[PDB]
């Protein structure tokens, strides 16, 4: 009986939690709790007895009304519920308190009170904070909070919590004390609290409208505190763009970030009291790759813009997650794109949604991005949730244009601030704003709703019409998602299309701006006055998270990847273009597996694709990281969508022979690049300015060390001298890329030890060396893999090292899929063994089985066969049971 909720089941407590009074005393054996509850019986009550959350807590003692309640006759506890019989809760408000026993020193699951390294820390999203004191511990029940935190002064003279500090003093023993007061109600997955030896940077910020001076500081441990500077000017421009795309001010006194080195995310939105991996905050040109500096600020605004979308309007229950993540996400890509002013940073949002939550939907874990029920709220916390979710809160943009869309998010602010809300209430504001562009009262979104309750990836396929003699070209637009086990009927969808027109002759715009609203099973859109046969751009942006089905030629999508104006249209034409080759090339290698073939042909790759990959490489003002992008083929997670039964090897082997097919033609063109790229793309002018990031200049690396990865992989005449002189470069970007395209050479384990010297004395360093061995295209990767865990890895439950040494590894197409299970056994053996600490990331550690049922039919059974035995662990959480229950269709 693992007890399902059902959204439909939603009901207001009959309980109130008016008042948290907390006094947490941090001791070296164990921590403390004193909780008092101020509580009432709400107009929902039905006489129920009082059950409170409260998972692996020592109860000291209990009371209500400041009598103590007596075990068994007054009260039981199972050591996940405290349930007090009615009889003995009182009718009017009354207090509860208790006194409980919690061990953060050994709490490995990185949720409710624990220790990372020397620094006590809380993790309460979404269940953690019944793992602190007794709570009717969901989203709904707004509290003031009053919190005291006490420790021993010299391990931990920063103290931090929600709110305002009021008092801070001496308590006997070397010990001492500080309170926050934070009155403005919160839910409890919002409480936090931190106490440590924490260095920090601090600013001042202005607010836009009311000036109010706002105390930003950001913390960490004091080895790094020289790594915090780039976050602290991400959080001052995360501030300075929701006050002028939104019109948002922040309304408290200081906002305080912090980086801690055991996190089993990204980060957290604690109100006033921001919680990071170490890896999401911290950052130097020195000690980081390129990759950090955007990380840094996505999570740094994300969490900023929580302040509104989470923590000001927050969720009425779990359910309405996507709410806040979804929501949260299109502002922090909204913010990312303003920010970094490159067109790859809308590609890689597209990138991560086609490849990672395209496989998710169409997996047996497929859910709507508001499901509809859960056992482990923790398994919600989806890229369904966040991506899709991400991309049905942009396509509200789309449909309103920036100016109604604006309307419609302040109507939403101003009718839910301070406030639990559902994502009706969204939809509903959204509406508003519907009805005032089309000068339509009778305008609803309605139908929009479908996209928060059907599961599935929209199949969208065109036909396409030119009459000549008439200047009338029609676009023929299909729309179908395919049943799955949450829904034996799909319904159609809102499914706003931005469209371009391209005229061939000379790569012009032929029509203005135009976004079609499909919301029919199929459309017809004509167009007149349309002098010549266009090629159509479709779904400019990507505006609506389909599988784009464009049947265009393949010179259609080479003329538009040379001449459209829009980004993402030219790199879907590409993608198009390779997944034609892929899935040709796939096939002929599979029968000739089949057949046994001594002898077959394969179709070459498109010589004017890879002219017109040339013409655009050979451009300079086109973007290099956009370049990257085209020489790349679709990652394997993008492509699994399209095979059935994909065996690997071959989709390997189809892989090398389409990169071997370009670069015999391209090598000499990527050689020069690389050369050429040098000067700007290494320049050292600001590698000493923390404040100075040019995401260009990024991207130029990006791309340099692409082409230098494609032409090693083909062992260009001398490459090894070009990689050897890569290592010396003082960025980690290429330095660690020297690492892995050494791989194909005899100079790999002097790399390796060269690298490894100088990533061993930065624990994040330290942690993107390990990903790049672990990613190492190597023959001897398994005894690698071997090396570090016996000589770096050992028994860490740090996870970002379990997720650094295993999961790059598991995107080795050829070597994690061998054909004994070796790769499947490895993980599933690393799975089990994490789960006995952490749940949470024991089920991360699973994401490479979500495609299981892809596979050929053994590689299937391969897989199944370890996911069966990972079931069958006596000790198995409830979260790994669950996810592994739901992925093997149990
Ligand atoms: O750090 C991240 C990265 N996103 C993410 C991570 C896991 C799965 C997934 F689909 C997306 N997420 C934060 C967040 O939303 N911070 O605001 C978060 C996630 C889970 C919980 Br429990 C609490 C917080
Ligand atoms: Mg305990
Ligand atoms: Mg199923
Ligand atoms: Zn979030």
């Known amino acids: 009986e693992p007890k399902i909720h059902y959204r439909k089941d939603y009901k207001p407590s009959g309980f109130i939690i008016n008042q948290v009074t907390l006094n947490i005393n941090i001791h070296d054996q164990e921590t403390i709790v004193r909780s008092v509850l101020d509580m009432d019986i709400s107009k929902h009550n039905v006489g129920e007895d009082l059950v409170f959350d409260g998972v692996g807590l020592k109860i000291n003692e209990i009371s209500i009304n400041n009598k103590k309640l007596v075990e068994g006759e007054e009260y039981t506890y199972d050591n996940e519920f405290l349930t007090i019989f009615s009889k003995f809760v009182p009718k009017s408000k009354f207090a509860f308190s208790s006194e409980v026993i919690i061990h953060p020193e050994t709490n490995y699951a990185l949720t409710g009170l624990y220790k990372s390294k020397n620094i006590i820390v809380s993790q309460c999203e979404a269940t953690g904070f019944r793992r602190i004191t007794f709570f009717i511990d969901r989203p709904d029940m707004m509290a003031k909070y009053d919190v005291t935190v006490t420790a021993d002064k010299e391990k931990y003279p920063v103290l931090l919590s929600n709110g305002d500090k009021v ?81 948002l001010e922040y309304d408290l006194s200081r906002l305080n970030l912090v980086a801690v080195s055991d996190f089993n995310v990204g980060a957290m939105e604690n109100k006033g009291l921001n919680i990071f991996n170490a890896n999401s905050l911290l950052a130097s040109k020195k000690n980081s790759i390129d990759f950090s500096y955007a990380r840094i600020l996505t999570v740094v605004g994300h969490e900023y813009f929580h302040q509104y979308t989470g923590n000001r309007v927050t969720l009425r229950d779990w359910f309405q997650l996507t709410l806040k993540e979804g929501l949260t996400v299109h502002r922090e890509n909204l913010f990312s794109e303003e920010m970094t002013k490159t067109v790859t940073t809308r590609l ?16 047996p874990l497929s859910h709507p991005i508001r499901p509809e029920s859960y056992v482990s709220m923790e398994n919600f916390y989806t890229t369904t949730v966040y991506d899709k979710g991400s991309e049905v809160m942009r396509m ?54 479908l996209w928060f309750s059907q599961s ?30 949450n829904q034996k009927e799909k319904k159609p969808l809102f499914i706003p299309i931005s469209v371009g027109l391209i005229n061939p002759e000379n790569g012009k715009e032929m029509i203005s701006q135009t976004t079609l609203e499909l919301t029919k099973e199929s459309d017809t ?84 694709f890879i002219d017109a990959i040339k013409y655009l490489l050979e451009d300079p003002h086109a973007d290099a990281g956009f370049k990257s992008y085209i020489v790349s083929l679709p990652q394997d997670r993008y492509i699994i969508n399209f095979v059935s039964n994909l065996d690997t090897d071959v989709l390997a082997d189809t892989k090398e022979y389409i990169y071997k097919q370009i670069g015999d033609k391209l090598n000499d063109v990527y050689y020069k690049m690389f050369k050429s790229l040098e000067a700007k793309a290494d320049d050292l002018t600001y590698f000493n300015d923390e404040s100075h990031v040019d995401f260009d200049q990024m991207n130029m690396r990006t791309l340099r060390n692409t082409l230098l990865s494609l032409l090693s992989k083909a062992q260009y005449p001398n490459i090894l001298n070009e990689i050897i002189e890569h290592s010396k470069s003082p960025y980690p970007s290429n330095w660690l890329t020297s690492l892995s395209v050494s791989a194909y050479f005899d100079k790999y384990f002097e790399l390796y030890d060269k ?99 892809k596979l050929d039919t053994k590689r299937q059974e391969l897989m199944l066969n370890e996911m069966n035995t990972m079931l069958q662990e006596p000790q198995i959480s409830n979260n790994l049971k669950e996810y592994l229950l739901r992925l093997t269709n149990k």
Request: one cysteine or more; a neutral charge.
């Open 167 to 247: 008092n801070e003093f001496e308590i006997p023993g070397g010990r001492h004390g500080a309170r926050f007061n934070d009155p403005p109600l919160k839910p409890c997955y919002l409480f936090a609290v931190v106490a440590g030896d924490l260095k920090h940077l601090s600013a001042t910020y202005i607010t836009k409208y009311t000036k109010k001076k706002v105390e930003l500081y950001v913390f960490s441990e004091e080895k790094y505190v020289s790594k915090l500077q780039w976050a602290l000017e991400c959080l001052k421009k995360s501030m300075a763009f929701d006050e002028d795309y939104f019109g």
């Open 348 to 363: 890689s949002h597209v990138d991560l949604l086609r490849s990672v939550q395209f496989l998710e939907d169409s997996s």
């Open 525 to 608: 859109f004509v167009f007149n006055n349309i002098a010549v046969k266009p090629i159509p751009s479709l779904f400019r942006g990507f505006s609506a998270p389909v599988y784009i089905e464009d049947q265009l030629t393949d010179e259609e999508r080479i003329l538009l990847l040379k001449y459209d104006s829009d980004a993402f249209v030219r790199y879907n034409s590409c993608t198009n273009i390779y997944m034609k080759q892929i899935l040709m090339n796939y096939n002929e290698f599979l029968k000739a597996k089949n057949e046994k073939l001594e002898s077959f042909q394969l179709t070459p790759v498109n010589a004017q």
């Open 755 to 853: 690298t490894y010297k100088l990533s061993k004395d930065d624990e994040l360093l330290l942690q993107e060396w390990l990903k790049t061995v672990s990613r190492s295209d190597r023959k001897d990767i398994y005894e690698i893999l071997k090396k570090l865990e016996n000589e770096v890895l050992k028994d860490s439950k740090n996870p970002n090292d379990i997720r650094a040494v295993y999961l790059p590894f598991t995107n080795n197409l050829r070597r994690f899929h061998d054909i004994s299970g070796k790769g499947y056994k490895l993980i599933a053996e690393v799975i089990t063994k994490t789960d006995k600490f952490n749940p949470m990331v024991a089920t991360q550690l699973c994401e490479p089985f979500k495609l299981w049922n």
């Open 396 to 449: 509200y943009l789309t449909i309103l244009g920036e100016e109604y869309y604006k309307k419609g998010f302040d109507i939403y602010i101003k009718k839910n601030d301070g406030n639990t809300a559902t994502c009706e209430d969204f939809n509903y504001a959204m509406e508003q704003a519907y009805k005032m562009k089309k000068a339509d009262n009778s305008a609803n979104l309605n139908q929009y709703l």
């Open 456 to 485: 599935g990836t929209p199949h969208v396929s065109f036909k396409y019409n030119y009459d000549a003699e008439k200047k009338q070209y029609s676009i023929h637009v299909n729309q179908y998602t395919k049943p799955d086990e």
